[PDB]
Design a protein around this nucleic acid. Structure first.
Ligand SMILES: [K+]
Ligand SMILES: [K+]
Ligand SMILES: [K+]
Ligand SMILES: [K+]
Ligand SMILES: [K+]
Ligand SMILES: [K+]
Ligand SMILES: [K+]
Ligand SMILES: [K+]
Ligand SMILES: [K+]
Ligand SMILES: [Mg+2]
Ligand SMILES: [Mg+2]
Ligand SMILES: [Mg+2]
Ligand SMILES: [Mg+2]
Ligand SMILES: [Mg+2]
Ligand SMILES: [Mg+2]
Ligand SMILES: [Mg+2]
Ligand SMILES: [Mg+2]
Ligand SMILES: [Mg+2]
Ligand SMILES: [Mg+2]
Ligand SMILES: [Mg+2]
Ligand SMILES: [Mg+2]
Ligand SMILES: [Mg+2]
Ligand SMILES: [Mg+2]
Ligand SMILES: [Mg+2]
Ligand SMILES: [Mg+2]
Ligand SMILES: [Mg+2]
Ligand SMILES: [Mg+2]
Ligand SMILES: [Mg+2]
Ligand SMILES: [Mg+2]
Ligand SMILES: [Mg+2]
Ligand SMILES: [Mg+2]
Ligand SMILES: [Mg+2]
Ligand SMILES: [Mg+2]
Ligand SMILES: [Mg+2]
Ligand SMILES: [Mg+2]
Ligand SMILES: [Mg+2]
Ligand SMILES: [Zn+2]
Lengths: 53, 49, 147, 111, 101, 118
RNA sequence: UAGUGAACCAGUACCGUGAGGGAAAGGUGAAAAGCACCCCGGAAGGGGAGUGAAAUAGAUCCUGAAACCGUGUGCCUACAACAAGUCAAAGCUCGUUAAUGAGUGAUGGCGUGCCUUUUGUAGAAUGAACCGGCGAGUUACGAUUGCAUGCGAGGUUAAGUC
RNA sequence: UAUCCGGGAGUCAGACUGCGAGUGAUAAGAUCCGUAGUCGAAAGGGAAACAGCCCAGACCACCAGCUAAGGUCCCAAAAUA
RNA sequence: GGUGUAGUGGUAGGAGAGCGUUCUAAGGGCGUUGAAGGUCGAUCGUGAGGACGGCUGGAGCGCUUAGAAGUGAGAAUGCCG
């Protein structure tokens, strides 16, 4: 099977509506104040839950 | 006469007709040859007589 | 000169009428109602703008069906499933859901477009002689000569 | 004077995939943009971050703008030159391969 | 007060101080013109011409002669390799109404 | 004496494209689609310059009919009466009177009805 | 994309066992004066600072179209069945080769592409993915007719010599 | 308008409708002639849509008017004559 | 030139008259105070098409008369990019 008709710019853009990246779970790190991912170790200060690790 | 004011005698010269140069000219597409057949082919046509 | 008057949406005042369907043939009631809803009865009629007035139909249950239409006029509808055809007689519709009877009749007569559907919303059908729209102060619209 | 721009040209990355990360950061404070790019795992995030950091360096070093005020006013990815490559396929035929490149521009303004 | 007058095979409503565009009139710009066929006169009271109001005339002045925006007639028949293109600018006369009688 | 393509081609195609401004996507961007669409637009434009006259006469007739009904008359009876009374006011002016000068339209209707009675 | 296949290290690269087939590829600026130094970056690449008449002439370098891709937004769009236009039109926005202006456009009327080939094609017949360039009645020698000019019961030279 | 003289053609697949015949089964949107029209090469109005049927032949502009076929309760212009 | 009357759908195709492209001749012009080219604009003509502004561009190009053609592309499962 092959495309009977080429896809127009508008239809192509509509389909890609949901083809987007997302960034979730960022919040300030308690120890150093930098942004970190919740439930992850802070890459900057290497502290999690207020302790160095 | 003056080289910048030349004028040929009326009816002495005519403009060549060019075929296959658009429809509105009257000889576009088929170039006056009609539709298919032997006489419509390049070098087509039968010998005299 | 391009001076023909064109009505605007919202500038035209839409009144409210009450139409009594008692012993009026369904089609003739519907035809007059559709003209009113479209606004054909007012000089300001503008095809691309809604200008008609609201209609309250009362006594829908007593609408008249001439001939044997009560039992032979059949309303079909297909569910779009194979063998999904349903039917109901006009008489049964009048007895049980007369609002549907009048609404289908008038839907057929309004235009099949966005404006037509909007105009259809202005219709209100009630079997029986009392309606909940007294707040709009509707006025009686005799149709004896209009049919 | 109020704005500084940085551009990375002919970067070997898909323009569409790069535009995904660019849309994330557009119209955000420089601090927020840095955080977003640092925690995004997509490849183009690192390249866009280098461009963004280069733009911030321009704003401060060249024009002495206030880093804390800076925000990402404009950011976009433009198609770069495409390197043409071929991949052999079944039955002795090749198919072309487009090795895309991107021009990544980040503009950062005072406010 | 307003009038309805017959002009250029058409009927126009005219109000004093209002310009009107009509089919080209053979009158020079800035010269007085008089429309003698007044099919109606209205205002506070209504006069109905049958077919014309007797002894009613409307006066105007020809501000300008012009040509309306060009209109292109492009006639073609699909699959018949034939088209014809034509242009048109309809002349018009603009008349400011001075007095309605 | 070679005559290379030059710029006439681009000029002609650009004229077509400019004519096609506002169309949907390729119908304004691409010369072939644009030309094909511009030809249809010409067909519709020529046809509609005639249909437009019909539409407005239809509109005036409908408005006159509503006004006549309010004055106790049908459109057809009103026009017949006006012809009997020698009134030449056309449908455009009549519709304008119906919407704007109701009193004038009523006066016209009275004369029409009188002619019908006679 | 012409002109030699070849304006350039071309009968080269490349293809083929071999005979053989056979490309693509010109242009900074007047002058390299071809961006010292500084800044982000491992670099690439940028931003300044400079050269320059000009750097959006920075070596992919004159001009830099269209397809195609993206950023910004003035108008519209989530009850609608749309050959996508045209005709009519509110609202909003804007003010031009100053013209009975421009953009957008709710809503309403009408409306089955272009080409080829056919008795007949919206056609479920053929061709075109799009854009650009290139791409088809010519020339020579004769025949004949029209028109034009010169001469006119005449008209005219061919080869050849200067 | 007809001839006649000369330059230049294209056409030799036609279709349907009405009327008169054959072939066919007094079938076919069949086939083959005769005759008229239309399409072909004809847009517009009507026949829902519908080359060939009915009305009628678009050089153009108009937000003017009268009619043809066909229509006038609503979609949908005009008689709930 | 004016008036009047009539006429002006159209495929194959015939006739006529024009638009635009490159080049030649002559004349008369324009250009670092910005040519060609590109781009935008609400501009003119009955048509092909012609101007005029803004921007870009950086060195050649119009106009009038005549002449000669590799003289006009949207379709060739066309060629090249
Ligand atoms: K011929
Ligand atoms: K330059
Ligand atoms: K846009
Ligand atoms: K529409
Ligand atoms: K096939
Ligand atoms: K002959
Ligand atoms: K026959
Ligand atoms: K220009
Ligand atoms: K092609
Ligand atoms: Mg010649
Ligand atoms: Mg022809
Ligand atoms: Mg063709
Ligand atoms: Mg052919
Ligand atoms: Mg044949
Ligand atoms: Mg032949
Ligand atoms: Mg192999
Ligand atoms: Mg070409
Ligand atoms: Mg008409
Ligand atoms: Mg070569
Ligand atoms: Mg530039
Ligand atoms: Mg360049
Ligand atoms: Mg709904
Ligand atoms: Mg909605
Ligand atoms: Mg066939
Ligand atoms: Mg195909
Ligand atoms: Mg047959
Ligand atoms: Mg044929
Ligand atoms: Mg027809
Ligand atoms: Mg056809
Ligand atoms: Mg009539
Ligand atoms: Mg009606
Ligand atoms: Mg009756
Ligand atoms: Mg005609
Ligand atoms: Mg040139
Ligand atoms: Mg050529
Ligand atoms: Mg092409
Ligand atoms: Zn931390």
């Amino acid at each position: 099977a092959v495309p009977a008709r080429r896809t127009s710019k508008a239809k192509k853009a509509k389909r890609r509506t949901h083809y987007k990246l997302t960034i979730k779970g960022l919040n300030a790190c308690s120890n150093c104040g930098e942004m970190k991912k919740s439930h992850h170790v802070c890459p900057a200060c290497g502290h999690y839950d207020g302790k160095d690790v | 006469m003056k080289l910048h004011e030349l004028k040929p005698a009326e009816g002495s010269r005519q403009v060549r007709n060019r075929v296959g140069r658009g429809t509105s000219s009257g000889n576009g597409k088929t170039a006056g040859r009609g539709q298919k057949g032997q006489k419509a082919r390049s070098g087509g046509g039968v010998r005299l007589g | 000169m391009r001076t023909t008057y064109m009505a605007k949406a919202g500038e035209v005042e839409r009144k409210w009428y009450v139409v009594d369907a008692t012993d009026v043939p369904l089609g003739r009631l519907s035809a007059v109602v559709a003209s009113v809803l479209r606004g054909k009865n007012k000089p300001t009629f503008t095809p691309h703008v809604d200008t008609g007035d609201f209609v309250i139909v009362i006594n829908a249950d007593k609408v008249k069906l001439t001939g044997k239409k009560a039992t032979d006029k059949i309303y079909y509808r297909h569910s779009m499933y194979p063998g999904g055809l349903k039917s109901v007689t006009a008489g049964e519709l009048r007895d049980k859901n007369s609002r549907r009877l009048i609404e289908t009749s008038v839907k057929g007569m309004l235009p099949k477009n966005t404006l037509g559907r909007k105009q259809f919303t202005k219709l209100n059908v009630y079997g029986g002689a009392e309606h909940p729209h007294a707040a709009q102060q509707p006025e009686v619209l005799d149709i004896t000569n209009l049919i | 004077i109020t704005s500084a721009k940085a551009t990375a040209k002919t970067v070997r990355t898909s323009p569409r995939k790069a535009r995904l990360v660019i849309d994330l950061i557009r119209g955000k404070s420089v601090a927020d943009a840095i955080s977003i790019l640092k925690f995004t795992p997509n490849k183009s995030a690192g390249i866009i971050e280098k461009v963004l950091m280069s733009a911030v360096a321009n704003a401060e070093n060249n024009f002495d703008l206030d880093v804390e005020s800076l925000v990402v006013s404009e950011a976009f990815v433009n198609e770069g030159p495409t390197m043409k490559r071929f991949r052999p396929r079944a039955k002795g035929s090749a198919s072309p391969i487009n090795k895309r490149t991107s021009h990544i521009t980040v503009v950062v303004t005072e406010k | 007060m307003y009038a309805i007058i017959k002009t250029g095979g058409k009927q126009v409503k005219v109000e004093v101080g209002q310009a009107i565009y009509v089919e080209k009139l053979n009158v020079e710009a800035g010269e007085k013109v008089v429309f003698d066929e007044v099919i109606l006169v209205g205002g506070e009271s209504t006069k109905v011409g049958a077919p014309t109001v007797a002894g009613a005339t409307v006066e105007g002045t020809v501000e300008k002669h012009g040509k309306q925006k060009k209109v292109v007639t492009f006639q073609y028949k699909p699959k018949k390799h034939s088209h014809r293109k034509q242009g048109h600018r309809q002349p018009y006369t603009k008349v400011m109404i001075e007095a309605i009688n | 004496a070679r005559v290379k393509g030059g710029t006439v081609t681009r000029k002609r195609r650009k004229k077509v494209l400019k004519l096609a401004k506002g169309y949907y996507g390729s119908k304004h961007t691409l010369f072939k689609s644009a030309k094909e669409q511009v030809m249809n637009s010409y067909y519709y434009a020529f046809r509609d310059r005639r249909q437009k006259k019909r539409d407005f006469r239809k509109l005036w007739i409908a408005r006159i009919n509503a006004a006549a009904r309010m004055n106790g008359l049908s459109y057809s009876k009103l026009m017949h009466g006006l012809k009997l009374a020698e009134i030449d006011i056309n449908r455009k002016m009549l519709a304008d009177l119906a919407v704007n000068d109701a009193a004038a339209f009523t006066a016209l209707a009275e004369q029409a009805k009188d002619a019908l009675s006679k």
